[PDB]
Design a protein around this ligand. Structure first.
Ligand code: Z0I
Ligand code: Z0I
Ligand code: ZN
Length: 140
């Protein structure tokens, strides 16, 4: 589990969005496994605006923050999960590291702020759904 709270937006894995997230939908993209919903309260998080390829992610299945190198956001074939059939996932960054399904929502951070959230993995990889291209999360 996990979310990003920036301005009056909540950014979650689409596959973990709640009833309230759908009722209060701002934007979602199945191919990215992202959903953004509106919030009452102001969030404290900053979104990175950068092309960093190094950062730190939170892995709930290890209770550990791991420094990683990751690929630039790309279109990657992802095997079937509980939530999606086997398909190409877009805006996805890969790193060598530990990931289990319930690690989804773990934040990946760089010096500039939030880079993305855990969305995929296994096989000794972790995949993050990038948010840095979503410039509108910084306004309105
Ligand atoms: C932009 C980018 O990928 N830079 C990068 C690479 C490796 C380490 C660090 C520490 C800060 N930035 C780092
Ligand atoms: C959607 C989903 O289940 N994502 C996910 C994240 C991290 C690791 C794994 C291993 C299978 N699936 C994973
Ligand atoms: Zn950065």
């Amino acid at each position: 589990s996990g979310a990003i709270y920036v301005g009056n937006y909540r950014v979650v894995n689409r596959h973990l969005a709640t009833h309230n997230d759908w009722a209060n939908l701002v934007w979602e993209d199945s191919s990215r496994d992202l959903l953004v919903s509106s919030t009452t309260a102001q969030g404290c998080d900053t979104i990175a605006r950068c092309d960093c390829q190094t950062g730190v992610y939170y892995c709930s299945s290890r209770r550990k923050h791991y420094p990683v190198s990751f690929s630039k956001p790309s279109l990657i074939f992802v095997e079937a999960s509980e939530y999606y059939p086997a398909r190409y996932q877009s805006h996805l960054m890969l790193a060598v590291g530990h990931s289990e399904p319930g690690d989804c929502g773990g934040i990946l951070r760089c010096q500039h702020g939030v880079v993305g959230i855990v969305s995929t993995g296994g096989n000794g990889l972790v995949g993050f759904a990038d948010v840095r291209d979503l410039l509108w999360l910084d306004e309105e």
